[PDB]
Write a protein that binds this ligand. Structure first.
Ligand SMILES: [Zn+2]
Ligand SMILES: [Zn+2]
Ligand SMILES: [Zn+2]
Ligand SMILES: [Zn+2]
Lengths: 142, 23
């Protein structure tokens, strides 16, 4: 569907740019993501390293662990955009480490586990925020 | 449990970003 495909594109495009160094609502989301997601990574490098270790991703397809933790994160019934942006930013940190340990790692299985957790498990919440527009407005700075 | 620690780290950082842009 639209929300799944739109989200997958946004999250993959961010994850691929991050790993390599390379609709309209989607362009906005992508811009916001670069600014906020980069904010998250810088200043939380040491925490992110620590989590990556404890997760112990063996390869590009070793996502089952990442899925379970992400599900766990949301199991308190709290939903907000700071958390969502954090999940995606960690996603990009993991993508960068994947390419440094195998230069033709596909970022796709990872973007997919993130998109799945987000869109299947927070579908109606996202729809109610008007999707990626809620994200863009939340992180909107003047 | 490694998973509890990872989850908590995610929420700590996530909620901090939430609070910052909420205010
Ligand atoms: Zn795929
Ligand atoms: Zn808007
Ligand atoms: Zn728990
Ligand atoms: Zn901690």
């Amino acid at each position: 569907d639209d929300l799944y495909r739109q989200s997958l594109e946004i999250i993959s495009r961010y994850l691929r740019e991050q790993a390599t160094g390379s609709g309209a609502a989607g362009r906005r989301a992508l811009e916001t993501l670069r600014r906020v997601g980069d904010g998250v990574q810088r200043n939380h490098e040491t925490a992110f390293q620590g989590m990556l270790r404890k997760l112990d991703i063996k390869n590009e397809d070793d996502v089952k662990s990442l899925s379970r933790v992400m599900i766990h994160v949301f199991s308190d019934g709290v939903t907000n955009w700071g958390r969502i942006v954090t999940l995606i930013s960690f996603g990009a940190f993991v993508a960068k480490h994947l390419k440094t340990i195998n230069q033709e790692s596909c970022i796709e299985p990872l973007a997919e586990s993130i998109t799945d957790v987000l869109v299947r498990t927070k579908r109606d919440w996202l729809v109610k925020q008007r999707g990626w527009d809620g994200f863009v407005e939340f992180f909107h700075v003047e | 449990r490694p998973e509890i620690w990872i989850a908590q780290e995610y929420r700590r950082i996530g909620d901090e970003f939430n609070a910052y842009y909420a205010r």
